[PDB]
Amino acid sequence: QCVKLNDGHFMPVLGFGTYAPPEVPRSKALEVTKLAIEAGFRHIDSAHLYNNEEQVGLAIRSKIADGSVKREDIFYTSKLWSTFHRPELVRPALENSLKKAQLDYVDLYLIHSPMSLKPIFDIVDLCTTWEAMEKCKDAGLAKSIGVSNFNRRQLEMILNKPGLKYKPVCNQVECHPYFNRSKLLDFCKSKDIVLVAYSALGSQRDKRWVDPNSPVLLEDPVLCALAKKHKRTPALIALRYQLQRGVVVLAKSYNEQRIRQNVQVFEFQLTAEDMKAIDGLDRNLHYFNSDSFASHPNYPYSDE
């Protein structure tokens, strides 16, 4: 199923995460995205940063051409990188992403991060950035627009902005049972903004940002015990948890069996006591925990 965004477009509640580290050959993105779509994923999440938009766009285009899906059946997201926050760079950045994927529009374009970087931090009025995002929606380059990695104060800046034309439709943020973002989620619901969860499975645990001493979400004993009870897997439990919270949930896998397993999130339900047990895991643990972000004046996790 899908969720009605606050601008009237619709978003599939489960999305495919397409990020892979640079040691994974770029042709895997084409292959796995084709698998995702065959498996039943209709929401595909990419970004300028992932250096995979040609491959992902080709995968979407390949599945339109062969007859499996229609463009308007696919919800494709891309993201504005933090070196392009200056308002005059926004539209050309988006048009670059589209030429790379060879598509006419993105369903969703997001400000990837509030932590501006020089075109080595930058200072930019993100309200100016949002104005340019708005014009990309008027132009039809993006059906919807939203933000990513914003905390409550940052989201409030946009929402309170003088003569705002469009609210962000979503805020895509790290969100999983160790960092469930309850309060931020409550804020979003009260504003008709969708929370989209990334690293819903614990992240890829990339050395560049994630301490390998951190606990592995999918080895959690409460997730394991729910997986045993439901006869599913800890991944499916963590994904189903989010849908029942009203959170749209991304799942990255580059494995043919796991990609298919993840669509089974629609085949079962957790009870109220399951949801409470999982809610009890929250431990203010964000996996991305890096000097590269932490020392930024607009670091989202300062207000915690």
Ligand X SMILES: NC(=O)c1ccc[n+]([C@@H]2O[C@H](COP(=O)([O-])OP(=O)(O)OC[C@H]3O[C@@H](n4cnc5c(N)ncnc54)[C@H](OP(=O)(O)O)[C@@H]3O)[C@@H](O)[C@H]2O)c1
Ligand Y SMILES: COc1ccc2cc([C@H](C)C(=O)O)ccc2c1
Reading the block at residue 151, the tokens are 């905390």
> Which one of ligand Y, ligand X, none interacts with residue 300, CB within 5 to 8 A by kind?
ligand Y
- Interaction of residue 242 with ligand X, rule CB under 6 A: no
Let me know if 241 is a catalytic residue.
no
Site for ligand Y in 154-173 (CB under 6 A): none
> Which one of ligand Y, ligand X, none interacts with residue 75, CB within 5 to 8 A by kind?
none
Instruction: Choose which of 91, 236, 288, 298 interacts with ligand Y (CB under 6 A).
Output: 288
Site for ligand X in 97-126 (CB under 6 A): 112
User: Which lies closer to ligand X via its Cβ, residue 160 or residue 267?
Assistant: 267
Catalytic residue selected from 50, 76, 241, 287: 50
- Interaction of residue 44 with ligand Y, rule CB under 6 A: no
Site for ligand Y in 96-135 (CB under 6 A): 112-113
- Interaction of residue 178 with ligand X, rule CB under 6 A: no
- Interaction of residue 300 with ligand X, rule CB under 6 A: no
- Interaction of residue 52 with ligand X, rule CB under 6 A: no
- Interaction of residue 19 with ligand X, rule CB under 6 A: yes
User: Which lies closer to ligand Y via its Cβ, residue 33 or residue 149?
Assistant: 149
* Non-local CB neighbours of 240 within 8 Å, separated by 6+ positions: 232, 265, 268, 269, 270
Nearest-CB residue for ligand X:
17
- Interaction of residue 59 with ligand X, rule CB under 6 A: no
**How many of the other CB atoms lie within 10 Å of CB of 2?**
14
* 203 assigned binding-site residue: yes
Residue numbers in the known binding site for substrate are 112
Give the active site residues: 50
Binding site for ligand Y (CB under 6 A): 19, 47, 49, 112-113, 149, 288, 293, 300
